[PDB]
Amino acid sequence: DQELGKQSRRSQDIIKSLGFLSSDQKDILVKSISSSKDSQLILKFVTQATQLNNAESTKAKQMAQNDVALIKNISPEVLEEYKEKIQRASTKSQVDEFVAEAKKVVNSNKETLVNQANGKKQEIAKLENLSNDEMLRYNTAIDNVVKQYNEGKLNITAAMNALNSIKQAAQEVAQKNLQKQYAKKIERISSKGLALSKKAKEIYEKHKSILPTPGYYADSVGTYLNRFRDKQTFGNRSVWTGQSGLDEAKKMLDEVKKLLKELQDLTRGTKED
């Protein structure tokens, strides 16, 4: 008698805890247990209740798994992630939240990917030393990444890395193209300097008698002559390249100008000897 008192209160609590019965289903079974005079019948109620919990648990999970499969443009990876989370769920409310969380992830992910790709389209666009043809080729490349993603040929991680890989390659070509544009600017400046250098050598060789300490001016003239020919500042230093070289070549031009000017002022008016 007093067993029931304990046994019935147990069995009712077993019912209330099952994760997949609805409220209406619980109430019918809870009521039947609390009305029974036998402990053996109370067992049969707890049995068919778990049997129904299992039935509704299958129906619930399976459905949800097919629900998320119909999120359109679902990444194969994300589908598997949530199909599996759902399968492991304890209750119906968790199963619901998972189908919620799925959609939020599938749009967060595509919203993210789409923002990064656009952000890179722009940063590539501001690389001033890309050919127009080279700029189309990488904007197109980006688009192909977002397409293969939509077609689930890439996960989100794969696709973020391809955007980075394309951005890095667009930089390394930006610079190869900048070094070529520097190099060309350098030879322009180092040609003016060579023509000025030849002017100063002619000046020197025709009025050196007139010069204070002419051996200094011979060495100077000679130094700048070789520099602009070699495009090195010293004999065992690098050739002028990139923007350290252009500054250095711009530095040397304005030095030989001063030198030329100086020779011009030391010889002014005197005649050729």
Side-chain angles (χ1 to χ4, degrees):
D1 172 67
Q2 69 300 358
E3 299 91 18
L4 287 195
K6 184 207 63 194
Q7 173 163 6
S8 186
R9 251 185 319 260
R10 294 253 176 279
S11 312
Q12 304 186 201
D13 298 330
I14 291 176
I15 317 287
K16 298 179 174 143
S17 65
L18 303 175
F20 289 96
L21 303 197
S22 75
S23 173
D24 289 36
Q25 300 175 306
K26 280 175 190 161
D27 300 344
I28 304 186
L29 292 156
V30 165
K31 185 56 222 156
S32 310
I33 289 160
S34 60
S35 323
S36 198
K37 325 173 193 80
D38 184 343
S39 314
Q40 279 282 8
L41 295 170
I42 292 184
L43 291 195
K44 288 95 156 187
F45 283 130
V46 160
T47 302
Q48 73 165 257
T50 74
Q51 291 293 119
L52 183 69
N53 197 43
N54 305 354
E56 295 255 298
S57 162
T58 284
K59 163 183 154 193
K61 282 169 179 175
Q62 192 153 6
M63 209 143 288
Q65 280 157 345
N66 285 312
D67 271 271
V68 301
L70 301 169
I71 304 184
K72 263 320 290 164
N73 289 69
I74 180 81
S75 179
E77 285 90 349
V78 168
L79 174 55
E80 168 153 334
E81 182 179 10
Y82 279 85
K83 269 176 67 183
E84 168 77 356
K85 286 188 173 202
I86 283 171
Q87 167 63 44
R88 298 301 155 171
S90 296
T91 72
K92 176 78 200 317
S93 78
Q94 295 169 8
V95 152
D96 293 345
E97 295 170 27
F98 274 132
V99 194
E101 186 174 84
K103 329 183 166 183
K104 296 164 185 297
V105 158
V106 172
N107 295 110
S108 302
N109 269 19
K110 176 168 189 52
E111 181 256 27
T112 297
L113 179 83
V114 164
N115 285 344
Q116 190 81 332
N118 295 331
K120 301 259 157 305
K121 267 186 161 264
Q122 285 140 9
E123 288 162 17
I124 291 195
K126 316 218 288 297
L127 298 194
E128 219 261 351
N129 291 76
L130 283 173
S131 153
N132 266 34
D133 303 73
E134 290 159 14
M135 157 143 177
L136 241 190
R137 175 182 183 271
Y138 298 120
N139 277 181
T140 283
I142 286 178
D143 300 332
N144 295 336
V145 169
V146 185
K147 288 341 282 155
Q148 296 164 19
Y149 173 82
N150 280 339
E151 301 167 344
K153 286 180 178 185
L154 296 178
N155 63 69
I156 188 63
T157 308
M160 294 284 300
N161 294 5
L163 285 192
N164 286 339
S165 185
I166 290 165
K167 175 72 189 293
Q168 302 175 39
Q171 297 172 176
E172 299 192 13
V173 170
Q175 316 237 6
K176 293 188 175 200
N177 275 11
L178 183 56
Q179 296 303 267
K180 271 191 290 252
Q181 196 235 22
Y182 267 146
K184 129 176 165 167
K185 272 170 184 166
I186 271 180
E187 163 140 311
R188 182 189 344 273
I189 271 68
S190 71
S191 277
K192 295 177 185 187
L194 191 79
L196 293 206
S197 268
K198 291 213 171 204
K199 260 193 186 176
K201 176 167 169 196
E202 153 153 330
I203 286 196
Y204 170 88
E205 291 297 344
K206 298 183 176 176
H207 313 70
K208 42 169 179 303
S209 56
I210 308 294
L211 261 48
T213 179
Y216 162 85
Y217 293 108
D219 284 9
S220 299
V221 172
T223 289
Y224 293 91
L225 260 176
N226 294 291
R227 281 169 160 170
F228 286 127
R229 291 179 193 125
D230 296 351
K231 276 160 283 198
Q232 332 172 30
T233 304
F234 296 104
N236 263 338
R237 298 280 183 90
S238 299
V239 177
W240 293 334
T241 38
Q243 86 147 340
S244 59
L246 178 91
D247 294 333
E248 190 70 356
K250 276 175 89 301
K251 178 194 187 166
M252 302 300 311
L253 175 58
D254 294 283
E255 263 176 59
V256 77
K257 286 177 178 178
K258 273 149 223 147
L259 182 67
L260 175 59
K261 185 61 189 159
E262 177 161 47
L263 297 173
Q264 279 171 349
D265 290 328
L266 292 177
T267 79
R268 195 151 221 258
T270 89
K271 52 193 179 57
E272 176 168 342
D273 253 24

